[PDB]
Ligand binder design. Structure first.
Ligand SMILES: CC(=O)N[C@@H]1[C@@H](O)[C@H](O[C@@H]2O[C@H](CO)[C@H](O)[C@H](O)[C@H]2O[C@@H]2O[C@@H](C)[C@@H](O)[C@@H](O)[C@@H]2O)[C@@H](CO)O[C@@H]1O
Ligand SMILES: CC(=O)N[C@@H]1[C@@H](O)[C@H](O[C@@H]2O[C@H](CO)[C@H](O)[C@H](O)[C@H]2O[C@@H]2O[C@@H](C)[C@@H](O)[C@@H](O)[C@@H]2O)[C@@H](CO)O[C@@H]1O
Lengths: 309, 309
């Protein structure tokens, strides 16, 4: 009826980026999800381009922090007073769960904390870890804590950046017990309810499962669970944001096509609120050809039955 | 006609990513470049979607390395035997300058070197630096060297990744003398000339300068030069690669529009071989509205006269 035609990118899975951590996608995965709550806040976008949760457009700002730091005496810990994505004042009253790009899982994220002194352009960088399950993790309040390897090198009142690399685990405890990718941090700290969240998703149609876009996070210490599943590639977020094509039903039928043959491998539902389901029962690593890609074919309804994956 | 209509993304500058290092764009910059060679190898793509140089599609696989490492006795240095993205051996006979995403400047890039032991999922991470001007920097031959902070923690024959964060400088020497963003590394080391390069670019038309998409690399030690200019945002590379719209002339005329007024701020030439020029003489940080964007207007020839920026 004259709506702007909806499309998805023709990039292959391996040509795209995880929307929950700045690393490439590796594979597609489906499994049952009744045993956990699927409520990530990064990689959330409606098909007509409305960003949700803490989702923002940059693949390299995910799980980053910016601001200035204060040393906590008697430790190697620094409190970062957060700034916005472009180094302006952070506004805690904005109707979002936390600063855009904030991590959306409980875990210990390791990276580098870097700093420049404005006056002379001197710089410094130190390995640092943020414990997103810890009491000082209060990004919505404008404050997070980093554990570092220095007690004096960082200066006050100078622009400071955290660049994430990977995750760690406490090797004296049960292996792969953290990170917990489906447990949201408490963005305002212990026992304070989160706000303005993108909703939890579940396959609501009988016989369906979520389809996840999966990567493996680097591990930096211990025995971490390095699996990371997102609902939408970052490139799909960027694509929908720009196109802003209106959803003509609750569900977009996508076909996964092998361009080498022109043949469809499977079909799936892209729900207009921004997640994908498939008709399958059980945990399964999808085996796909390297040049395979998703193609929008038609608008269907909540009552459409998918061909079994 | 019926040729596929050419477009550029409507993402704003601050919503896009530098194509030469995994950091957000900050600003537009123009300056004279007649006195030196502008020949970056990342962020090189024709308007009809042909990747050039060492350019690849991922915003987060730029200046990364992966492979396995060997310890150099009596040092904290490790040699990395490079692998491809899916962990097979790099093939030096491919007609490219170096593995795709290899750094295209001479400098000391600091980040974290991480590793997983496959047998038990144990992991480890250490601050590391690669000096792309050094004799062991031979990515085209399949080998680079890292300086780290350990002499024994990394294991042999285990998958190892370098994630870049920023750059350093030797603070006992002249400030901001490195990195040198317009000096290409020697991809095969000492005394071997580089091959299969994307060409140098220059404005030919009187009164014109290159328009650069600029970021500030994090600094991790010393007094580095942190300016980093690319010719095309990474998102434009991804866009042209997917669209593959044929060039109807040598130059796509773009207008940069201010939505708050509906008026054009400036116009520029996007050359079909993948770079932008503007009519200006001198160094200038462009002042743009946060919601400003580029819009393709028409195909013109190389000798079209732009309104002064
Ligand atoms: C039972 C038990 O505690 N296991 C230990 C494990 O804790 C050790 O890991 C080191 O622990 C320290 C803290 O005391 C740091 O967290 C180190 O980063 C960590 O080493 C890293 O992870 C381990 C699993 C190895 O992969 C190592 O190469 C990494 O540097 C280890 C140290 O050898 O011993 C027992 O496994
Ligand atoms: C005059 C002069 O040489 N300046 C020194 C400066 O070089 C020192 O910096 C350190 O140098 C060592 C190498 O010997 C390492 O590279 C350190 O990382 C480096 O410190 C870092 O950069 C300096 C400029 C500071 O920003 C510092 O905070 C960083 O950690 C310093 C040491 O403090 O002394 C003189 O400034």
């Amino acid at each position: 009826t004259g709506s702007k035609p909806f499309t998805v990118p023709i990039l292959t899975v391996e040509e795209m980026t995880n929307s929950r951590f700045p690393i490439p996608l590796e594979k597609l995965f489906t499994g049952p999800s009744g045993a956990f709550v699927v409520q990530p806040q990064n990689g959330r976008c409606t098909t007509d381009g409305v960003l949700l949760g803490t989702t923002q457009l940059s693949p390299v700002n995910i799980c980053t922090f910016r601001g200035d730091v204060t040393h906590i005496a008697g430790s190697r810990n620094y409190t970062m007073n957060l700034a916005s994505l472009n180094w302006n004042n952070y506004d805690p009253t904005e109707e979002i769960p936390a600063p855009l790009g904030t991590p959306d899982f409980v875990g210990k994220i390791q990276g580098l904390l870097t700093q420049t002194t404005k006056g002379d352009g001197s710089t410094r960088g130190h390995k640092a870890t943020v414990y997103t399950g810890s009491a000082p993790f209060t990004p919505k309040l404008g404050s997070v804590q980093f554990s570092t390897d220095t007690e004096n090198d960082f200066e006050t009142h100078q622009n400071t950046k955290f660049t994430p690399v990977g995750v760690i685990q406490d090797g004296s405890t049960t292996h792969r017990n953290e990170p917990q990718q489906w447990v949201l941090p408490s963005y305002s700290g212990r026992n304070v309810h989160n706000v303005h969240l993108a909703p939890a998703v579940a396959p609501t149609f009988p016989g369906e499962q979520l389809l996840f876009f999966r990567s493996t996070m680097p591990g930096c210490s211990g025995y971490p669970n390095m699996d990371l599943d997102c609902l939408l590639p970052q490139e799909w977020v960027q694509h929908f944001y720009q196109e802003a094509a209106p959803a003509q039903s609750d569900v977009a039928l996508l076909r996964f096509v092998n361009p080498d043959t022109g043949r469809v491998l499977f079909e799936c539902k892209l729900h207009k609120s921004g997640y994908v389901t498939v008709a399958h029962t059980g945990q399964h690593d999808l085996v796909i050809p390297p040049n395979g890609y998703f193609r929008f074919d038609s608008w269907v309804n909540q009552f459409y039955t998918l061909a079994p994956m």
